[PDB]
Design a binder for these strands. Structure first.
Lengths: 82, 153, 100, 207
RNA sequence: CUAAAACUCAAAGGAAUUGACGGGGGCCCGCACAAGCGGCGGAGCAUGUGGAUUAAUUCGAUGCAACGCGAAGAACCUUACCUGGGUUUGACAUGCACAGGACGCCGGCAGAGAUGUCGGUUCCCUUGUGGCCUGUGUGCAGGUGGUGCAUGGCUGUCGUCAGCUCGUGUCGUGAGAUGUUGGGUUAAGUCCCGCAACGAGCGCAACCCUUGUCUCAUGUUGCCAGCACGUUAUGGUGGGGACUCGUGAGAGACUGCCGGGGUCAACUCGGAGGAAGGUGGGGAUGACGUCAAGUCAUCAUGCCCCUUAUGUCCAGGGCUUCACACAUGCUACAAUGGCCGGUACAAAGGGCUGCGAUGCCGUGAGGUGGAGCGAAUCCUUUCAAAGCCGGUCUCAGUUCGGAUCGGGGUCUGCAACUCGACCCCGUGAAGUCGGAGUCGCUAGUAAUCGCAGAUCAGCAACGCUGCGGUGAAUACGUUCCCG
């Protein structure tokens, strides 16, 4: 995991996106490409359209899933069985 | 060995017993080059045998060797495009080597909780004619006898 | 290998010398001491804004002429294939076959 | 692969290095400009047979000594060729670079020159066997030349199948260290591809 | 017994030559077998491959001689594959032209970025124009696109085996034969004796490196034996070539000598001397060629193909997918051991924007800090582990084994989700020495223990290349197996 000194890594794009999203207390679907961005308690209500590789998966953040990264909730490989 | 026999290594005598046989035994029980540990094991086994019987290690060791020393063996020989189990006379050096190897190997399978105790018990039983090595010698002599008909080639 | 990729490696090197020399190194000095106020400074975020090509982590030691990306030797900057051929021709001073 | 390059086999005993300079921090750029100079001098001059190119470097000043069998072709009577080579050598970041154009004493005891001639004849229309015979017989006349082997490989005669041929005269002990073996390799460009020519020549031994 | 035809084939045949082959013979070799030691095949994990899957799981490599291989370092880059977004004289060269003083940078904005746009900066020649780019272009670039059955170059293998040829001569109508066979000997087509052959070349051997002994030279950063100062902290310090050591030159193994076999010939057995005795030990060196062996993905290249794309830029993903199969390794199944405490010995190698010490802070990765070092000096600790001594465990799926999983951290990197390593706490699977079958090894070898380097920001490293510590058993002999 990332070192504690450096602070959590959140991309600036979706950062300013969520500050402009929460300033009026409305949570519309936000579409992003940065899977590497962690989850901040400022994302508690917002729902992200996180990229997968083909499309964007909708992920509704909760209190439980804070501290993880977005890419956890956008599974890439599709395997059903042989 | 296609061009002839190879020279033999002249192993040296032992410090605390002065006999070739104990040095051969420590070389046989040697593992991974831990010569100090092998010497400790052999010396402890000899001391245990001395304490149990009250006599000198070397004489009872020689008695055990003579008890487990073979004289006839069986080898697979191919004559006329056909293989047989031919009984063969054993040279003294090979008999001593086989006896020591059997002693060590059978002492390694005992259930006396320690190498020193297992070796001491095995050598004492071989001296008294009860060890498993004695049984192996009896079986190999029996097998040599059973195939005596093939002794002519 | 490919001319475009040989060129792009050099372009990374000139980018590195232009940016990683002070811009992508002072931010690291800011982040090193926990005493230094990194969190509000956004030295992490500022250093994200810099191009990826500034980072030397994107560099690749290729053969200085051949462009071969693997089997490289740092002493000569040459591929294993080229070192063998030029050493045999007596081109690298003080190099010869081994025996011991 | 069977035989290593003879020059590298006796590099530390009989033959000498073709570049002479010392560098610790500036070894890489020295090598860069060395190979640039070599390729520039190889591409610029092709009519006169360029036997050898030495480069010496001391700080700013570079001495490039180039050997050819026809010095007049590569040099200018008013210095035109000299001016051209000087100008194109300054542009190679050679700072102050000066050239020593020199001539070989015997231009048929040199393996590189012999391979040059054999390739030039084999290129246009000459049958290869004639090329090797003429080259070998011309080499034997020279006094110091005591052995020669000439070998060519490729689609000889424009055939569909590659072949290798070689002719020898005298002694060529490639395994002997003290004996010096002048070695010359060159690729002749034919309409059907590329033909490789190798020449080994033995002129006595040094101790 | 006499005895056709239709139709079909471009041959069917005889003798002899060179190979190849034989479950034909003869003579020999090689860890080939035999005698041994340790393994694989059974278990968990690492790696590669096949298959399946997928949008893609980039490509090449298929017995020996593919399968810890190209890959001596796939999160991005690498990257050549997929999705999507841009771009076209192009991401990058050089030539013919028109217009120019800007190209170029530096900050802001939008965008995932490529990129687009906004704001400030503006060439020196010298009158002819040159350097820069703009567009307009035009030649052209650019292809890890195809063909290793069109190739060069490079490499593997038979095989470090002893063989492969040529000139002249001679024999045969001819392919071809002799020389190269025969006796002996050798590691060897090595040599001797014979011989329609006489010679020669590439092969063998020697010349090269290292290693084992000694002599001369040699003293710093290396030694310290004899002398002084030392303070514990030691060659640490003044001093000294004496012993090592470092690196220059040289000597020393040449069947040189003796005895015996031997055609008195090669050669062979034994002995003395010597450090070393019979190519001392190990390397480098790989003949003509074979297998259309491998490589158009190190590179080059004939031909074919793309060229508003099969070129080129970017973000994300993939190369890491898994019901299985094969191969190479690591860790184990324990008492010849586990854990704890103490304690002794190496070699080699690396280090400048690198090695990095003392000290301090953490339990520990590690953090702070920077002494000294381009290094026989300083750092890798003074270097190790196995080893030795002491205590404990008492034969159990255990104080063995460590997989898997939960939680908490460090470091690198813009970024450890897919997909890094390491640290701490807890968790504690299979595994009881492994069927048929199979592999390596003849002495400082096998076995076992640790150290270092390349690649490398970090690492998948248990892989590869080297270094040393401790160090065995066995070989009766070529009948069987392989070459």
């Amino acid at each position: 995991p990332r070192s504690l000194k450096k602070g959590p890594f959140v991309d600036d794009h979706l950062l300013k996106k969520v500050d402009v999203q929460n300033e009026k207390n409305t949570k519309q679907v936000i579409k992003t490409w940065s899977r590497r961005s962690t989850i901040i308690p400022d994302f508690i209500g917002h729902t992200f359209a996180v990229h997968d590789g083909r499309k964007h998966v909708p992920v509704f953040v909760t209190e439980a899933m804070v501290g993880h990264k977005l890419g956890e909730f956008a599974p890439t490989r599709t395997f059903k069985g042989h | 060995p296609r061009k002839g026999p190879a020279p033999k290594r002249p192993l040296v005598n032992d410090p605390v017993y002065g006999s070739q046989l104990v040095t051969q035994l420590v070389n046989k029980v040697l593992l991974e080059g831990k010569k100090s540990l092998a010497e400790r094991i052999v010396y402890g086994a000899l001391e245990q045998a001395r304490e149990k019987t009250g006599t000198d290690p070397v004489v009872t060791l020689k008695r055990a060797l003579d008890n487990v020393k073979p004289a006839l063996e069986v080898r697979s020989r191919r004559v006329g495009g056909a293989t047989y189990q031919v009984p063969v006379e054993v040279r003294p050096d090979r008999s001593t080597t086989l006896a020591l190897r059997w002693l060590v190997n059978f002492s390694r399978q005992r259930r006396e909780k320690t190498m020193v105790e297992r070796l001491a018990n095995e050598i004492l039983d071989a001296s008294n004619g009860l060890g498993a090595s004695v049984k192996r010698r009896e079986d190999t002599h029996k097998m040599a006898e059973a195939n005596r008909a093939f002794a002519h080639y | 290998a490919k001319k475009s990729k040989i060129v792009k490696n050099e372009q990374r090197r000139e980018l590195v010398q232009r940016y990683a020399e002070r811009r992508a190194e002072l931010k690291r000095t800011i982040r090193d001491p926990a005493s230094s106020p990194e969190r509000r400074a956004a030295a992490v975020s500022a250093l994200q804004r810099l191009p990826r090509d500034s980072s030397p982590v994107r560099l690749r030691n290729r053969d200085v002429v051949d462009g071969r990306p693997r089997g490289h030797l740092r002493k000569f900057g040459l591929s294993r294939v080229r070192v063998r051929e030029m050493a045999h021709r007596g081109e690298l001073p003080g190099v010869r076959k081994a025996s011991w | 692969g069977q035989k290593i390059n003879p020059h590298g086999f006796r590099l530390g005993i009989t033959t000498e290095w073709k570049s002479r300079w010392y560098a610790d921090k500036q070894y890489k750029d020295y090598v860069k400009e060395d190979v640039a100079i070599r390729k520039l001098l190889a591409t610029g001059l092709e009519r006169a047979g360029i036997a050898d190119v030495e480069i010496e470097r001391t700080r700013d000043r570079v001495r490039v000594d180039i050997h050819t069998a026809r010095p007049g072709i590569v040099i200018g009577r008013r210095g035109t060729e000299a001016d051209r080579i000087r100008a194109d050598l300054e542009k190679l970041t050679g700072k102050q670079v000066q050239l020593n154009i020199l001539e070989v004493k015997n231009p048929e005891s040199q393996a590189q020159l012999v391979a040059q001639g054999v390739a030039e004849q084999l290129s246009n229309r000459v049958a290869f066997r004639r090329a090797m015979r003429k080259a070998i017989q011309s080499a034997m006349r020279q006094p110091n030349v005591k052995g020669i082997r000439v070998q060519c490989s490729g689609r000889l005669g424009g055939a569909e199948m590659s072949r290798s041929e070689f002719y020898r005269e005298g002694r060529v002990p490639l395994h002997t260290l003290r004996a010096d073996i002048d070695y010359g390799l060159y690729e002749a460009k034919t309409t059907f591809g590329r033909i490789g020519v190798k020449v080994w020549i033995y002129k006595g031994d040094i101790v």
